[PDB]
């Protein structure tokens, strides 16, 4: 990561040049929308045709492959598993589950390689891109295996040697093809490269096949049985794993030196004068690489050259000595054939350690946040920190987390596994997710449910209410009831509640009566949301109350309605009109004092409405009829109250 960035991009457009145009930009979820226009430029041009072919520029164009989606799925699975398992350090068990995760990743990458090879041989045109991505991911696998055998599990002499042995056996697959070509062309028991195949089988440590090849060569020839027996005796004298590793490194080195000196003695005795094939094999087994320098075209690359040198003249490897021999092999390979590639430099850096420097070099060569974030988390979960691997430049962990979140947010539906990224951010991931989810709609179910759950867990309801009010207005656009009430309950709003209350009142006034009194009575009748909502609920229940007719509770509820004083006079007029048959009977519920107090409050509100505007005079021409009805009803009420007072006085006297 340097101060300077990279080279300019933007692929050339097949055309333009002769015409004068311009390209404008439009933002989006990581996908820039480019549009052709005629703004300020060097010239002027017009006359353009229309064709639906938008320009969508994005760096996530590799997501179109079916392998990358599965890769992201299993990467998210392994990441969640590691994050939920790394909560208590131990050491041995930690390294055990780390090796298990590494083996799972190896099997996953092998399956991905085989399926992408199937897709490659199925396709035809994209073969170049397929082989290029195969090569870069093979380099990635090499680097991953190297870091796993080095930093993840530091093995001494023996275990690491066997690890490198099987790594070379899995990476080299040319001796089998050579043997097959030898068996096919000419006679299957004699060829020009049979000795080369035998040498490769011996170098790869495949004695089970080397013995059979030597027996076949001895049966084909007529004077090679003694040489084959000598080679078998030398291979038997060559120590394996039972001499060192778990035994004694000094004894292993002594056995290796004894085998080497026995080989030198057998070569210098003079029996290796004849047979240029076996003579060259024995000379290579000693340490001389003249045949290798002559046939470097068949020696693959300097990586295999170095591992062969290590298998030959390196029983015990030292880190500084390893780097020295690595640069020596690189120089001796460049002196014979140049190689303008950065892979050798990347491997030399990985050998010379500096994990942060290697990460920076890989980022400035070909950016890949997924692998570097995974390796950073792996090296951080080991509870080991050194003064040469600390992150530099802002917060590398947060930067990689934001990149991994944007890589999923840049697409639809695939942004599901991005909410778990912000479970460890210091009150920043919530805002980062809000800045992405406050612009795109939410028409799913489980996604929005998990979003609301994580929001109520993190204790932040700003965007929650912002989405709840949008849902409430969308429900009001269709004139909902239960869903609108649930959204209002979840949002604890006020303006939208007043709006829906006014809408319900207007609907009731237009329809004359109300019939959906049970659709909004499922979430209430106890939790006092607001004054107007409580009044609406008490009127909705007063409907059934005066339907069943009960004088005491009806009088109490109409007294509450009159004391509310937050309602138009049109409702109070009908209330005073239809509350007279219920009071016509000789009752004692609420005395004349309180009754006429409510009546005087009603008439004062009516006079206030008269002085302000008009009592629905511009809407209907029934004001005189309503006044006459109110007058006759108050006269009947006064008569009934006088009779009740007379009866009370006669009973008390």
């Amino acid at each position: 990561m340097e101060e300077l960035d990279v080279d300019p991009a933007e692929t050339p457009i097949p055309g333009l040049g002769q015409q004068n145009r311009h390209i404008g930009f439009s933002w989006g979820p990581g996908d820039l929308l480019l549009y052709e226009t005629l703004y300020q430029k060097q010239g002027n041009s017009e006359t353009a045709a229309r064709c639906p072919f938008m320009y969508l520029v994005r760096s996530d164009e590799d997501i179109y492959s079916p392998v990358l989606r599965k890769l992201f799925n299993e990467s998210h699975s392994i990441f969640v598993g590691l994050q939920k398992s790394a909560e208590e350090a131990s050491g041995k068990s930690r390294k055990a589950q780390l090796v298990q995760v590494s083996r799972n990743y190896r099997s996953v990458l092998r399956a991905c390689m085989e399926e992408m090879h199937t897709l490659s041989e199925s396709t035809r045109e994209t073969a170049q891109k397929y082989i290029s991505q195969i090569s870069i991911l093979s380099a990635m696998e090499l680097s991953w295996n190297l870091c796993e055998i080095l930093f993840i599990e530091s093995a001494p002499a023996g275990p690491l040697l066997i690890l490198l042995l099987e790594w070379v056996r899995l990476h080299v697959c040319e001796v089998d093809n050579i043997v097959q070509d030898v068996l096919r062309s000419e006679k299957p028991t004699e060829h020009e490269k049979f000795w080369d195949g035998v040498t490769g089988y011996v170098l790869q440590g495949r004695m089970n096949e080397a013995r059979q090849l030597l027996a076949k060569e001895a049966s084909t020839s007529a004077s090679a049985r003694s040489m084959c027996r000598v080679l078998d005796d030398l291979l038997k004298k060559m120590p394996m794993l039972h001499t060192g590793g778990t035994q004694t490194l000094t004894e292993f080195e002594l056995k290796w030196q004894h085998w080497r000196e026995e080989c030198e003695r057998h070569l210098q005795n003079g029996t290796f004068s004849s047979n240029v094939h076996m003579e060259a094999v024995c000379r290579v087994l000693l340490g001389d690489e003249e045949v290798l320098l002559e046939k470097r075209d068949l020696m693959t690359t300097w990586y295999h050259f170095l591992v062969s040198r290590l298998l030959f003249k390196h029983p015990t490897v030292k880190p500084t000595e390893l780097h020295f021999y690595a640069q020596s092999s690189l120089d001796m390979f460049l002196a014979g054939d140049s190689c303008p590639e950065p892979l050798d430099n990347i491997l030399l850096a990985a050998f010379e350690f500096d994990i942060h420097q290697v990460i920076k070099e890989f980022s400035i060569v070909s950016s890949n946040w997924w692998f570097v974030a995974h390796l950073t988390d792996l090296l951080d979960h080991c509870q080991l920190f050194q003064a040469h691997n600390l992150y530099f430049g802002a917060n590398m962990r947060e930067f990689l987390l934001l990149d991994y979140a944007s890589g999923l947010f840049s697409h639809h539906s695939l942004w599901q596994l991005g909410v778990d990224y912000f479970d460890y951010c210091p009150n920043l991931g919530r805002e980062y997710l809000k800045l992405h989810m406050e612009r795109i709609p939410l028409s799913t179910e489980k996604k929005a449910l998990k979003a609301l759950r994580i929001c109520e867990q993190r204790q932040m309801t700003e965007q929650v209410r912002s989405i709840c009010k949008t849902m409430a207005m969308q429900s009001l656009c269709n004139r909902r009831l239960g869903s609108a009430l649930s959204w209002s309950i979840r949002a604890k709003d006020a303006a939208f509640a007043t709006l829906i209350s006014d809408r319900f009142l207007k609907e009731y006034c237009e329809r004359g009566n109300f019939t959906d009194l049970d659709l909004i009575d499922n979430l209430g009748s106890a939790m006092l949301l607001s004054d107007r909502l409580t009044f609406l609920g008490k009127y909705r229940e007063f409907h059934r109350m005066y339907s069943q007719e009960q004088f005491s509770e009806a009088a109490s509820l109409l007294l509450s309605l009159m004391t509310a004083r937050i309602a138009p006079c049109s409702f109070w007029l009908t209330l005073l009109l239809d509350a007279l048959p219920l009071l016509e009977q000789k009752q004692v519920i609420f005395s004349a004092e309180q009754t006429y107090e409510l009546m005087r409050c009603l008439e004062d509100r009516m006079a206030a409405k008269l002085e302000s505007t008009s009592p629905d005079e511009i809407q209907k021409q029934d004001s005189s009829i309503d006044n006459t009805k109110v007058e006759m009803l108050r006269l009947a009420l006064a008569r009934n109250l006088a009779r009740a007072i007379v009866t009370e006085g006669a009973l008390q006297e």
Binding site: A49, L402, P441
Partner: protein, 333 residues
């Protein structure tokens, strides 16, 4: 790999600007044909002409969009010394998706006599306000108290920043005790005028918008200003596109009482002063997250920078309008 052509759209005259909805799918254009066209990019990969209708008779220029959560309105700028707002009204209910929808003119933005600069929206927090500006130095703030009446525009704030304001950027609050900031970049058509950037704050002691701080460094005619998205921090970043690449950082020092009465002690540090375009810049735009910077020029060159690690911006994308885009560098994820 991108299907790039040499012709686009259907505007025969000089196409001015375009815009897209925050939810995507819906787009709109403004050209010199005195007719705006709204397109709907479907999921199949094609964007057909959804609607096309006249709006202004004096070369429509800018075009703004709003979120559907507060009302789908469209406010566009033109050179006819006036401006209006269009709305999309649908009928029926919700039986078969949305019924018949049509464009209407619910209200027309008044107080417009000269060249209208920018009339975009404002952050919510304390309410969704509308900022009306022109080429005289007067900024009005309108509010919509009636949710059922979109024609009500109550005037509750009228600031006089003097000079000739051109660009206006907003910065919302980060908590419940923070006030919104307003940056104003003027364009008096004279580089010899010292002072073109003004800062306004929402003082809680005066309940208005007084001049918080000024800057006498930038004297060239400012073309565009853009603040960085708030990420819960105290400092801020600003990009000023005038004649070169200018990015400054405003750091707080005294944002309390006593020591900071009507003004705030803020230090402005030039963190990026580049000029690799060898010309001038027009407009500057920030990414939705705050990591990509986009700008163009008069010579037909588009330059796009990205973030790094030291708060620096380097040219990543270089496109030629009259020529062909050269270079290829895609890092990926």
């Amino acid at each position: 790999m991108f299907v790039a052509r040499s012709i686009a759209a259907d505007h025969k005259d000089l196409i001015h600007d375009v815009s897209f909805d925050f939810h995507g799918r819906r787009m709109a254009t403004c050209s010199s044909d005195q007719s705006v066209k709204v397109w709907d990019k479907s999921e199949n990969g094609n964007w057909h002409c959804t609607a096309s209708w006249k709006t202004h008779s004096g070369s429509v220029w800018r075009v703004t969009w709003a979120h559907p959560e507060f009302g789908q309105v469209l406010a566009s700028c033109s050179f006819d010394r006036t401006a209006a707002v269009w709305e999309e009204i649908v009928g029926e209910s919700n039986d078969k998706l949305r019924g018949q929808s049509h464009w209407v003119k619910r209200t027309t933005l008044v107080d417009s006599r000269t060249s209208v600069t920018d009339v975009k929206f404002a952050p919510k927090h304390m309410g969704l306000m509308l900022a009306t500006c022109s080429a005289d130095g007067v900024v009005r703030i309108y509010e919509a108290p009636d949710v059922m009446n979109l024609s009500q525009w109550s005037l509750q704030h009228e600031i006089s920043c003097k000079l000739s304001c051109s660009c206006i950027s907003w910065n919302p609050s980060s908590s419940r005790a923070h006030s919104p900031m307003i940056a104003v970049g003027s364009d008096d058509s004279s580089p010899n005028i010292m002072g073109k950037v003004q800062i306004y704050e929402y003082n809680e002691n005066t309940r208005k918008y007084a001049k918080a701080e000024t800057l006498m460094s930038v004297s060239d005619p400012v073309h565009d200003i853009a603040f960085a998205p708030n990420l819960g921090r105290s400092f801020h970043i600003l990009a000023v596109a005038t004649k070169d690449v200018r990015i400054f950082t405003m750091k707080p020092l005294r944002k309390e009482l006593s020591s900071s009465g009507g003004v705030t002690k803020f230090e402005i540090h030039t963190v990026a002063q580049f000029d690799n375009h060898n010309s001038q810049v027009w407009r500057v735009s920030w990414n939705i997250t705050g990591t990509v910077l986009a700008s163009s020029g008069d010579d037909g060159t588009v330059r796009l920078w990205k973030a790094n690690y030291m708060d620096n911006w380097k040219c990543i994308g270089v496109l030629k309008g009259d020529g062909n885009p050269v270079g290829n560098s895609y890092q990926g994820f």
